[PDB]
Structure formats: structure tokens, C-alpha cells
Amino acid sequence: CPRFLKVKNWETEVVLTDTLHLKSTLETGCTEYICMGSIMHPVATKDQLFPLAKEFIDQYYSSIKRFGSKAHMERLEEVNKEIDTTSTYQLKDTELIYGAKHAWRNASRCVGRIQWSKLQVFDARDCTTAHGMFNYICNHVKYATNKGNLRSAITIFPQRTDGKHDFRVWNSQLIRYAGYKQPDGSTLGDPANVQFTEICIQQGWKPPRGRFDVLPLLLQANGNDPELFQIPPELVLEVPIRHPKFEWFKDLGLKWYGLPAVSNMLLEIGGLEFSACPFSGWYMGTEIGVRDYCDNSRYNILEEVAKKMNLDMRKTSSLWKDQALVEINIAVLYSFQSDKVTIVDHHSATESFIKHMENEYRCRGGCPADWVWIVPPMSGSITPVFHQEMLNYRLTPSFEYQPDPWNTHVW
Amino acid sequence: CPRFLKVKNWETEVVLTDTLHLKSTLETGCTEYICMGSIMHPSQHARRPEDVATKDQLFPLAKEFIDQYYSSIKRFGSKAHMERLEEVNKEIDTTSTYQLKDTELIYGAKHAWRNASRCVGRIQWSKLQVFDARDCTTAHGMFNYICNHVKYATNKGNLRSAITIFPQRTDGKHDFRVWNSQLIRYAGYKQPDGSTLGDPANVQFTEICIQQGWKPPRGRFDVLPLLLQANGNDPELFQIPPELVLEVPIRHPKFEWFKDLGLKWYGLPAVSNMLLEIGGLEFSACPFSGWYMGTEIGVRDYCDNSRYNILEEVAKKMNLDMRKTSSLWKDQALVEINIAVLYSFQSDKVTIVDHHSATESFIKHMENEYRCRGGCPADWVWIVPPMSGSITPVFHQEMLNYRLTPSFEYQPDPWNTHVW
Amino acid sequence: CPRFLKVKNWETEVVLTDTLHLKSTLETGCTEYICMGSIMHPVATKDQLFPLAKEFIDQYYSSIKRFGSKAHMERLEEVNKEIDTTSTYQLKDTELIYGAKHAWRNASRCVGRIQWSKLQVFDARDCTTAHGMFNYICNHVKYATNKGNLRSAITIFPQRTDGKHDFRVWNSQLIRYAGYKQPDGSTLGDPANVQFTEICIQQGWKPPRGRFDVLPLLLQANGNDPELFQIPPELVLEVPIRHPKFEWFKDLGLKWYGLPAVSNMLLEIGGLEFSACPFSGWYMGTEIGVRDYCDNSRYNILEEVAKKMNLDMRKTSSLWKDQALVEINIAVLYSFQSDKVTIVDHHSATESFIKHMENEYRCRGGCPADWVWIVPPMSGSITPVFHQEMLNYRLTPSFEYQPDPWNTHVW
Amino acid sequence: CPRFLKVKNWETEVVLTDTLHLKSTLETGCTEYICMGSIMHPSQHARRPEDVATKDQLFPLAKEFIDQYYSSIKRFGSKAHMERLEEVNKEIDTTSTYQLKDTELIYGAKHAWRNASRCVGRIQWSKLQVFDARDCTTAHGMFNYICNHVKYATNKGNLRSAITIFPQRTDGKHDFRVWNSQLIRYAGYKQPDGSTLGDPANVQFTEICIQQGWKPPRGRFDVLPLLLQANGNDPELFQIPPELVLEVPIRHPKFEWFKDLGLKWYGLPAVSNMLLEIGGLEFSACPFSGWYMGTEIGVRDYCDNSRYNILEEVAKKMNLDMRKTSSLWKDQALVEINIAVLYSFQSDKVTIVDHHSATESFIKHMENEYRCRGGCPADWVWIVPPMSGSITPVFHQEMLNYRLTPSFEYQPDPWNTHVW
């Protein structure tokens, strides 16, 4: 209603038909009179939980082609009686694995989704302490890093109960570099992590006060106060950045960590909320070379690189910024590849995604995709996704944003 | 329910408050459940293009516009206001249409631009030359007016924004149309090869010109003739006199071989297939023009696979290793091509803006609009340049998109609606 | 999107979940800011026809559980090649029957839909002349009337081609009484048919000028001028109206035809348009007893019946109209039943409809329903449908209104 | 795509033109593809009931309201208007809410009634006694106010339209609520045999009263006590003085046995569980009362299967043959029941209107509204009486349904939300 929505690719003229949108039950933020597509960010009762859980179990049995089976009906009644008696329910191992892979599949902002069926799911629902999370997270990192041959993974910690016993990873990612405010107003390190860094220092962390200090983990178990753990540095794979042509590039002293791991999202499955669900894939080059390095509010390195390139920086029309941007990203890929750390360029990534998408239309009736995020932050129209119309809508299971734990936690 | 909306700029932390969207009356295409932000021509429940506004459609569209004009000149509720409203209503009642005053036409056109959420050049919105062509009755008349526009707008390379507005629709069978999508474009030819010579985007329109008697030079940069429809008649061919057509040969400040690629482009960017809608009136022929942002030419026109597709050609001459995508040879060539376009326009003294300059200006414009107007409808998908996105400020700037009227609307290509 | 909608019955507290609304592709008339629920009324190119045909063919093959089969794929090719060469296509007999039955099934304004699958389909697509139409219509009347034991049926004449060769039954119904405007402004007969009666007279029909004269048929074949045909009187079943207690009722001289046959609607199946598709079922009493007899703009008999009942007509609060109304409707039912003419009272009808809805929600995931039309014109809240929430949406195949042929026709 | 809309009456052929709907700001719950005209409480994308208005929601709702008020007294753009508007904004900015002047409160209450698309009594909209109870602080305070209301409204049988408005929501933790759905209703008791003694619609609420200390007489027409919640506190019980509760014994003007059925009803129909929204301000306790239409009692209260369900009992005393539906025994008893109710109220000099008279007035009302206001939002499903529909003019009247503010809204039953 409308049953069918068409997307057109204006390069290839290929038109696909979406019916997957019909399965959407959650609102996106737009209305018929306003679109919020460029906005970054547009206690479960018994009554509420029965249907959310039914929706999921049905979806799961439909997927293994056993919809309506004695197993289907049995699980359905077990879950319902489990929620009747305990006001919540627990997922089967099969269900947890399926739901996690499907949240990834449904992540409309992730360009990496062709990989969605290949995900190592670590079940950490038996975890009860912060040192326990730290062990789990350490296993996760080691597995995923795999000496540079990166592997996709997630670690799922216990679901929320009453919102007062929440497991959280306070880090926004498992591995980031610290940020420190200087007396002159500037930032040393990554300006994104100044606040988090302060909380760590305030919690006892001894900072090297350098440009690329790997942050400690701040782990919260069962609603308790978070505890500081340092990841063993042998476990943290880093890649020093150099240029295949410019030998002065290494002189800039730039590096980045190999493992991209989001740790501040909330994984929702059948109405259950896993508020500590760190996951990791591998890097697309532009995340590091365009955003992390060249965002004005990040490491902001365009000026220095341009200087060493000896470019005329007097006029914007010389595109000196654009020239540096390419060399920078060239270096990042050149460096990761040279050290045999899994990395993908934006051309290759975006081509894979179009393929994934066409697969998804063929086998699922659509692929929710957020154009604003999917198109790379440089060279946009020279990638195929720029010319690909997309539909954005919300499917469950999903990954969602949640408040930063340090805004709602009482010590 | 109605509420003010915040947009945040994620680099500057600046937060603006949108109130203007509460005045929106037209649909965006999205729903509460499905966002259509990247669909080019979403369906918006707009009435069929072959149909004309009824009285019941015209009465409120006209009142809305007359109200906002008199509001804009601080005369709202005045006797002039009331009388103008009374006159407009009688015209619609007795003729089922009405005629805009000259003042209202200029205001209307300016605001359609102001409201064009896809235009990054809108800081210039109140400096628009308006040629009122409503007395035009023939194709040759349209030719004359268009030559005037091209001449005035080109201004020997010191481009001036302009729009020429032909008579509004009536019964729907007497429409004025410029068949050309732009005033100045290059022919496209399908080759025995299977390849396309020239601009592939213009292959169909070129076939029509040839079917109508045009004699194609059959080269790579043949300026197309105008195809002009006046008063619902069959369109006639006119060659724009070539001295009025400003072109820039493309060369590079460092690579001497670049000029040998034989690239060039035209100075005057002029859209001619849109519909200008003011107070329910529809101006189906309203070509308008500003000046280029370099990426328009260097990225899209030159490097789209479905356009001139020159990436491989240029990469060859730069001696790039094109065996792996991860050498980013494509992006490297793209930047150089775009350096050349900007350099060339500047050298020939032809107005052009680079994407850094244009986007910084758009941010300024937005801040002005929020302060003086309560917001600024903007389509992030179109506003962010096609290369180097996140190193321009607009990438980091949240934008609300909504449709205010007066506006520029899309309309069907005329060769799909016209009977001969 | 939303995937699930819920309807509640406020008498029984039963909640049903609609998913069938997702299949909708046609607009209703409402927007999010205005509801048009009580408004009575809120040629196809090659490209337009392909998807319409495909949608129908698909749903047809899905309905017989042969979707994706060999046969399905071939029928799709056949139709697409047929449109490509002829700019139209022909339905197989099986498809015509399926579409007709489903148009009925989807008719949100019809309360008799429990019978939807019991529809006799007469394929009149070979018809070429008005006399041909006349012969077909007599068959339909004889068959459907069936000596009083009414049978549902539809007769489908050829589909639109270029829009200049349409088949049309100009009669709004196959059987109706004439209406003659009197000099004093009043009307003899059925005021709703004055315009059509005049047309008929103009075409050379000799009017009896009575209160219950059966109109002739005006038949348009192949876009030609309509021709007159008198239905053989023996085929027109009629019921004299009498009351089981009021012996004076028969003296009112009232009567009515037994066969309710709608003849002015358009049947749309898979993009094809059947502009002449007369259909018939049987009467719900209130159609005659309330609307035909007691509409102010129809036979408007309330006053004379009230007079014969010796009611105090001086104050509205004596509810004399309501009293008269009930007695008139008792008379209609009693009359039809006595003569063994099929008829349903509005209680039985609405009970059956609720039962139908529940079936439809079970086996189809919903049932489009126009509450404004489904709830009977008297005694609304003592019928179950009054208390039943309903969702209205347009499914295809469908019956559509079309403009009166005497507003379009050039002679 | 805004347009005037036409509504037709199909008996009289009168056609009216609706311009007022263009003002509508709230959602009906329909979409273009799915009509929800018969859904009692459609999702209309309204914020969570337990949430309060933010500054960003409040500013535009307040401006819309103040604008329509000054426009109403023909002073739009005046100094008073500009000053009042500035004053309201300062209060919102400073306190995150604001206060209505007495004039604005009266105007608002009256317009909520005028805007109520489900009320057939709206020809009376301008004659409304507003009791301003915004100085109330206690449950006993509410009780006194409510007694004043019942006494004024009842006026010894000559009923008068009235509303009592209690303090507005603040942080939603100090809400004022009348837990009763109506000021005057009868208890209901579930019985061991599974039947209900009294009104089944009030079983849950009765249980709450009994659990709170109310001593039930456990009869068939027990007048319920008030459960009053002041300032977010737990509610308190108050029995209304029985001499303030006017009741009518039901008898039949021909059927002598009818009185033996022991039926009676109350004279004052007073809704007390709705939310009055004026300019973003939310009045969660706003009991209002008018007078009964006959069918509300005779058809719904007495013949609904889920209410008093008296049909078969009356039918037996009429010695009807109840063996077949087609005898229309139900329809017969129904009419007799509704005659008895009207006769009884009239005989006791207690104001009441029959459905024929009431709907004729509504048509007249509509026609006035269209003339002076350009529209009348109306919900046909609710406006058409529940018996003898098509013999009332409203059945044949096309109506457009849209939501205007100020308005009366539904809010969750207090016991489903309240913390003790």
C-alpha cells in the first residue's frame, strides 16, 4: 500500500522492484511533507513483548522453511509461557545466530552487507562480571584480527532485564586513539574521544599523552560501575602509513589500528535488547583516509600533507585539498595491503554492494539502504552506488543507537 | 503534529531551528515508514501533467501566493492586498485562470529559485534578471527571446543569472515548450560501431533534430539546434548563431598533453525543460541560467560512464597503473580533469565556481535563511558535490528537505506527449 | 508499512490482524489529513498494461499453487508477446472466471460476499451486436431468476479496445421501473429513472405511463448507437407487497422485481476493462423496504403507510416514521418469502458477513470493507457489523464506477 | 496538492464547497491507500500520552491558536495581537509553558466543541457555560466544582450546556483527572452465573471504586461515586448528593406494562474522560455536558448486546414471535423502546431531542458552517443515528472528516497509567 516500489539505476537503466518494504513496522522519521534522510538521528512490558517475539519466531521458522510446523508452534507456546511466567524470554542458540546475522543484513547504513551470512557469533550471555567481558572481548579481538586476515564477528552479552542491570561497553569502538584538550584550545590525538578519554583518566587511567594512544576498555556488567581494562598490545594490530611514491609520507608519523569494531550499539532481536554487542568487520579505506584523517574535527591532516606535497594552497580552485585527499587514501590502502591486513577500496566495496543489492532484490524482494551513508565520502559519482536509487526503511532484527552510558548511569 | 525541527552541523556543532517547513504544502515522496530521499523523481500525488488546474485548485493556490507576496512587501491585510485578491478571484471565476502582475512574476520566479532545494547556488537568489516573454506567440518569437537570454546571460564570459518566461498553460493543448533540456548542449550519435559519439544523454533528442531536417556535423562537440514549440504547435528548428555560443577549450596548467585530448565545454549553463509554478499558474517554458560549478562539467559530464566517460583516456596519458582499483587511478585522474576545467574557465575569463567555494557559500546562505526566513529547504543528496564530499562543509551539515511554492517542477519530455 | 493493522469488534472484544492491505496498489481518496470515507465517488498503453497483466497472472498462478511453474512462466511470455504485437491480450476462460469471482470478493461495498466463490460466469466475449447482447441478457435473467430460487451470475461482454468500440448496458440495472416527470413537478414511478426513461421514450419506446413499468433494455454493442429491446414479461419475476397483519397493505398497490442486477459498472481484471458486465445476486430486504420505498427522492411511501396505520404524525418524537419503516420492511420480507423468492433480512445478512470477515482474515489475511455501505440503512447498531471495525482499501480485480454512457456517446 | 473540496447531499442535490479543511493540522489516521473511517481510535502519530510538550512543539501550537483568536475578533495584526503573542512566547521560553487569558479559554472550549467531528449537537456550540476551574488544588475542590456543574447544567430538567476546566498538565506527574468516563453512570457487577447486574461497560471501574472503599448497594441502577485525581495524587471517592442527580423512570405512552420493566436513566449526559487541547495546552480534566439524543439511551445504552441488552425482554412482553429474524421482532421492540424514552423525558420536563429533529438541525448547522466558515468537519460513522439511518437526512449527506484545533481528544484510562 503501495505494494510495489521501483528503484532505477541511472547508469545502467536497470529497474528493480521492492516488496521487502511491506515488512517494515518501524517509522523512519520522514513524513509525506518532509524528508529527514540527512539527519543522523531522526522498559519492555509483557503485553508489548508477546507480538514482537511472535514476529521474530515466525520469521525464523519461515526462513528455514518450517513455517507452521510442530516445532514452530511448540517454540511459539514455550516463548509465550516463558514471558507469561518470567516477563521475558530467552533465545535459542540458532535464533541468536540468525537474528545477529539478520540485523547486519538489515543495517541500511552498512556497505559491507554482501558478507552478512559469514559472521562468527560469540555467545557471551553467561557473562556476569567486567573481567568476564574483558576475557570475551579479548577472545573476540584475537579471532577477528587473525594476524591481519580479518574475520567478521560479534560478541553478544546478556540482554537487558530492568534497565538497571545493563551490560555496556563504554567505548564507542573496541579500539580507538585517545584525545586530549591542550591549554591552547587544540586537541592532541583524536578529538572524537576527548570526553571518553577524560572519563578514563578520571577513572585511574595513566595516559601517554601522545597522538595515537590506544584507549583502555571501560566495561560495565550487570548495571554496576564500569571497570578499566587495557587490551594486551600484542593483540592490537596497527599499520604505519607510508606512500608508495612519497618517501616523506612515513615522516608524518601516521598510523591506524587494523580492527574496525563498533561497541556502542544495541542489537534488537524479537523485542529483546542486547545493549552490549560489539561487532567487527574490516575497513573500507575511505573511513580512515577521508574521515578519520581529513575530517576537520578529526586528525585533520590535509594542511600538512599538502605542505609536504609542496602545493599552492593560496586558492581553493587549485583543488590542492582534493589532490592531497587522493594521495592520503592511496597511502592507507598501500600500507594495509603491504602489511597483509584486510582492507577494501571504495570502488571495489561499492561494486560488491550493487551485486549484493541485486542479489537481495532477487531473493528477498529488496535491500533497505541509506544512500547518504552508502556513497563514499570522496569520488562519489565515480562509484556505482551514487547512480543507484535506494529505498530506506527499518527491518528487525536491527542495530540501533543508544544513549552514551555516561549520560544515564548513576555511580 | 507540527513542531520546530533542529538541524545540526556535525563539524561546527552549530544547531539551527527550522520553522519554515510548517508552511510546506506539497509532498516530498517519503512516508513515515519509507524514505525516498535518493529517488530522482518520486511520486508525489501531483495531478496528471496533461490536465489543467480546475477552479477549486486555482482559488487556494492563488490566494496562498497573493498572501505571501503582500506579506513579503509588508502590506498584508492592506486594501491593495484585498483588492488584488478580489480581482484574482473574479478572473478565476469568469475565465478559470488569471494573469500575474509584473511585480508578482519577478517575485514568483525569484522565489522558485529560492525554494529549489536541489540548487547549491541559491545565495544568489535575489539577483535574477527576469525576461517576461508572455506576449510571445510564435516559435521564431521564442527564438528571438532565447537569443536575447543567451546574449544577456553570457555577457562575454562575465555570466549573469537570468530566466525567460513564456506564456503559461491554458487548456493544455497550447503549451509553450523548449524541447531542449538545456539551451546549449552537444549532439549524441549512435555509431555503426555500437559506440556513442558525442554526449550519449542527447542521442534521442539528436535523432529528433535529424528527423526534423537538422544536418549533423557528426562530431564530438556539435552544439545542438533549438527545437521550439509555441502555442501547442509542432516544434521548429533554429540554429543559435554561433557567436552567441561561448565555449572553453579544456587544457591543464601542468600537463601539456591535456589540450591534445580535444575536450571543450560551453560557458552558459541553462536549464530549459522545467515547469515554473507560481500561484497555481504553470509556465511550461521558462529557461533559466546561472554559471557552472566545476564538478558539473569535470565530474559528471566528463566522467560519468553514461556521459563522455573520459577517465580511461586521461589515466592513459598520465601513465597511471590501471590494473588495480586500489591504486585509486580513477580518483587521481578525476582530480586532474577537474583542475583543468577550473583552470581553463578562469584563463578564458568565464565565470566558474569550484566546489569548495560553492559549498562554503551555501552554508552561509543557509545560516542567512534560518535567521531571516526560519529555514532553507535543501536536498543533501544533490547539494553535496560528486567528488570530495566530506571535505566540503555541506557533507557535515544536516538538511531538511521540503517543497515550498513557487517552485521549479519536472515535466514530461515533450516528444512523449506531443501529437503532430 | 505498517505491516500489521488491527481491527477490533467492540461487542465481542475480538481483535483481527489485517495483512491483506499490503496487496493494495490503488488509491482510496483519503490522505493523512482528510478522510473521504463518506464521499460516494472520491485507454491503457503497452507499457501500462505489461505490469497490470503480470500482477494478475502472478496472483492467478499463486492461487492454484502453481506459482513459478512451467505453465506460469509460459503464460507470462504468451501474454507479454501478445501485448507486444496487439497492444492488448485475451484472458483464458479460467482467468476470466477467477477474475470475476475475485472482483466480487474484493468489492468492499457488498455485504453478500460470503457467496463469492458461488458465481456463475457467462462468457459473452464473442458478442458482436446489440441483439446478441439482448440474447445473452435474457439467458442471464432466466438463469439467475430460476423461478424464484435466485442464483448469482455475471455476464461478461467484450473488453474495451480503443475506447470507441465499447460494449455498454445503458440501464443502471437490468430490471427497473420507469419514472415520469409530471407537470406539477411531482414524479410518477421511480424518480431515480426519469432521465433514463426520457432517453428511452426519445428512442421510440412507448411508455405505459404507470407507477411500476419495467424499463426496456438500451444496448450498445461495439461502440455503436444503443438499441432498444423489451425483456419478455415471463422472464421478469415480480412480487406484490402485502403485510402479514395489515390487510390494507396490499391496497397500497406496491410491488417489486425479484432480480437485483447491476448493469452499469466496469469489471477490471489484469489491466483489461470490461465495460459491460451485468451481475446479479439476490436482495437484502432493506434495499427495497428502506431505500427504494422510503428514500425521499425515491418512491417515498412513509407518509401514506403512516396514514394507513393511523399514527400521530404531528411530532417527530412519536417516531411514526420509524414505526412505519419497520412495518414496510416486515411486508417486503413477508411478501418475498410467501412467493418463494429468495431474499435475506438485514440481520441474517450482517451475521453472515461477520462470519465471512472472520473466514477472510483466517485464509486471506483480511477483507476490505466499506462500513458506511455495509451497515444497513435501518437498525444499524442492532446488527453486528455496526460494532465491527473495518479497513477499506482497493484490491484488483475490481468493480469500478464509470461515467453514464449518455454523457460520452456521440450518435 | 491543496484544493477546495465539494460535498454533495444526494437527496436534496445541494453541493457545498469545503475550504476549511486546508486549515487542518492533525492526522485522521487514513492514508491514500487505506481508509480508517470506522476505526474508533486510529493511530494518528500523536506523541506518547505520558510525555509533555517541548518548547519546539509548543511555540507553533501557541502561535496558531493566538493567531486564530485575534483573527476571530477581527484584530489580526493589531498591537494587542503582537503584544499577546510576544507575552506567550516569553512565557514558553521562560517556563516551558504558558497561561491562557479567560477570553482565550472560553473561546478555546467553545471551538473544541465546534471542532468535534463526532458531535451531532454542534448547532449549540456558541451557547456554552465555561466554568474556569484552573485555581483548583484538591480532590474535594474538584468535587465542589463538579457539584456546581451538575447543579447548573441540570437546572431542574431544563438542561444547559456546560464545561468545567481544571488545571492544565505540567510535568505530566501532577495531572488532574476525573477517573469516571461520565459524571453520572450506573455501576456494573459480574455475577456468579456469568451475567452482569447493571451496566457491563462499568464493571472494571466499579471494582476500582469498591476496592477503594465504596459500599455497593449491588442493584441495577446504582449511581457511581466520583473518583477524583488532583495534582497527580491518588484519586479520592465522593458520592454526588442524590438530590443533584436527576433521573427519569421509563414508561410507555400505550404499553402499560413498560414501567414494570423497572427501567430508568439519568438526565445529564456529561463526558469526563477526554482531553481538551487548546494551543498546545492540555486540559486533562474537562467534564462537559449537553443533553441527550434519544437514541443514545434507547438504542445504545439499552439495546446494545454489551450494555443493558433489553431487546428480548421487551420483545416477550410485546408477545412478538422471536423465532425468526425476518419477522424483525428486534426492530419492532427497538422502536417502542425509543418511544418510551422520549415520552418519559418529555413528561418529566427533562430536555431531550429525538434523532429526526437532531439530524435536521445538524444539516442546518453544516449549511451555516460552510457559509460562514467554509466547512464543517464531520464523522459520518458517528453522526448517523444507530437506528433508522437512511430516513434521517444525515445518512444522505456527504461529510468530510478532518481534525481542527482546539479539539477534544482521547487519553488513556487513568488506572492504566497511574502510580499509587
Ligand code: HEM
Ligand atoms: C566485513 C566488512 C564490513 C565492511 C567493509 C563494512 C562497511 C561499513 C562502512 C564503511 C560503514 C560506514 C561507517 C561510518 O561511516 O561511520 C558501516 C557501518 C555499519 N556497519 Fe558495517 N561493514 C562491515 C562489517 C559489518 C558487520 C560485521 C556488522 C554487524 C554485524 C556491520 C554493521 C554495521 C552497522 C550497524 C553500521 C552503522 C554504523 C553507525 O550507524 O554508526 N558491518 N559498515
Ligand code: HEM
Ligand atoms: C548562479 C549560479 C548557480 C549555481 C552555481 C548553481 C548550481 C547548481 C548545481 C550544481 C545544480 C545541480 C545540477 C545537476 O547536478 O543536475 C543546480 C540545480 C538546480 N538549480 Fe542552480 N545554480 C545556479 C543558478 C541557478 C538559477 C539562476 C536558478 C533558477 C532561476 C537555479 C535553479 C536550479 C534548479 C531548479 C535546479 C534543479 C535542476 C534539476 O532538478 O534537474 N539555479 N544548480
Ligand code: HEM
Ligand atoms: C448473492 C447475494 C448478494 C447480496 C445479499 C448482496 C448485497 C449487496 C448490498 C445490500 C449492496 C448495497 C447496494 C446499495 O446499497 O446500493 C451490494 C453492493 C454491491 N455488490 Fe452485492 N450482493 C449480492 C451479490 C453480489 C454479486 C454476485 C456481485 C458481483 C459479482 C456483487 C457485487 C457488488 C458490488 C460491486 C456492489 C457495490 C454497488 C455500488 O457501488 O453501486 N454483489 N451488495
Ligand code: HEM
Ligand atoms: C447540547 C446538546 C448535545 C447533543 C444533542 C450532543 C450529541 C452528541 C451525540 C449523540 C454524540 C455521540 C456520543 C456517542 O454515541 O458516544 C456526541 C458526542 C460528542 N460530543 Fe456532543 N452533544 C451535545 C453537546 C455537546 C457539548 C456541550 C460538548 C462539549 C463542550 C460536546 C462534545 C462532544 C464530543 C467531544 C463527542 C465525541 C465523544 C467521544 O468521542 O467519545 N457535545 N454528542
Ligand SMILES: c1cncc(CCCNCCc2ccnc(-n3ccnc3)n2)c1
Ligand atoms: C556523529 C553522530 N553520530 C555518529 C557518529 C559516528 C558514528 C560511527 N559509525 C560507525 C563508525 C565505525 C567505526 C569502526 N568500525 C565500523 N564498522 C565496523 C564494521 N562496520 C562498520 N564503524 C558521529
Ligand SMILES: c1cncc(CCCNCCc2ccnc(-n3ccnc3)n2)c1
Ligand atoms: C537523470 C534523471 N533526471 C534528470 C537528470 C538530469 C537533470 C539535470 N539537472 C540540471 C542540470 C543542469 C544543466 C545545466 N545547467 C544547470 N544549472 C544552471 C544553473 N543551475 C543549474 N543545471 C538525470
Ligand SMILES: c1cncc(CCCNCCc2ccnc(-n3ccnc3)n2)c1
Ligand atoms: C447514488 C449515487 N451513486 C450511485 C448510486 C447507485 C447505487 C447502486 N448500488 C447498487 C444498487 C443495486 C441494485 C440492484 N442490485 C444490486 N446488487 C446486486 C448484487 N449486489 C448489489 N445493487 C446511487
Ligand SMILES: c1cncc(CCCNCCc2ccnc(-n3ccnc3)n2)c1
Ligand atoms: C468504545 C470505545 N471507545 C469509546 C466508547 C464509548 C464512547 C463514549 N462517547 C461519549 C458518550 C456520551 C455519554 C454521555 N454524554 C455524551 N455527550 C454529552 C454531550 N455530548 C455527548 N456522550 C466505546
Ligand SMILES: C[C@H](O)[C@H](O)[C@H]1CNc2nc(N)[nH]c(=O)c2N1
Ligand atoms: C549530515 C550528514 O548526515 C552526515 O554528515 C553524514 C553524511 N553521510 C555519512 N556517511 C557515512 N558513511 N558516515 C557518516 O558519518 C556520514 N555522515
Ligand SMILES: C[C@H](O)[C@H](O)[C@H]1CNc2nc(N)[nH]c(=O)c2N1
Ligand atoms: C540516485 C541518485 O539520487 C542520483 O544519481 C542523484 C544523486 N545526486 C545528484 N546530485 C546532483 N547534483 N545531480 C544529480 O544528477 C544527482 N544524481
Ligand SMILES: C[C@H](O)[C@H](O)[C@H]1CNc2nc(N)[nH]c(=O)c2N1
Ligand atoms: C452520503 C453517503 O455516503 C451515502 O448516502 C451512502 C451511505 N451509505 C450507503 N450504503 C449503501 N449500502 N448504499 C448507499 O447507497 C449508501 N449511500
Ligand SMILES: C[C@H](O)[C@H](O)[C@H]1CNc2nc(N)[nH]c(=O)c2N1
Ligand atoms: C466500529 C464503529 O466505528 C463503532 O461501532 C462506532 C460506529 N458508530 C458510532 N456512532 C456513535 N455515535 N457512537 C458510537 O459509539 C459508534 N460506534
Ligand SMILES: [Zn+2]
Ligand atoms: Zn525521506
Ligand SMILES: [Zn+2]
Ligand atoms: Zn478515510
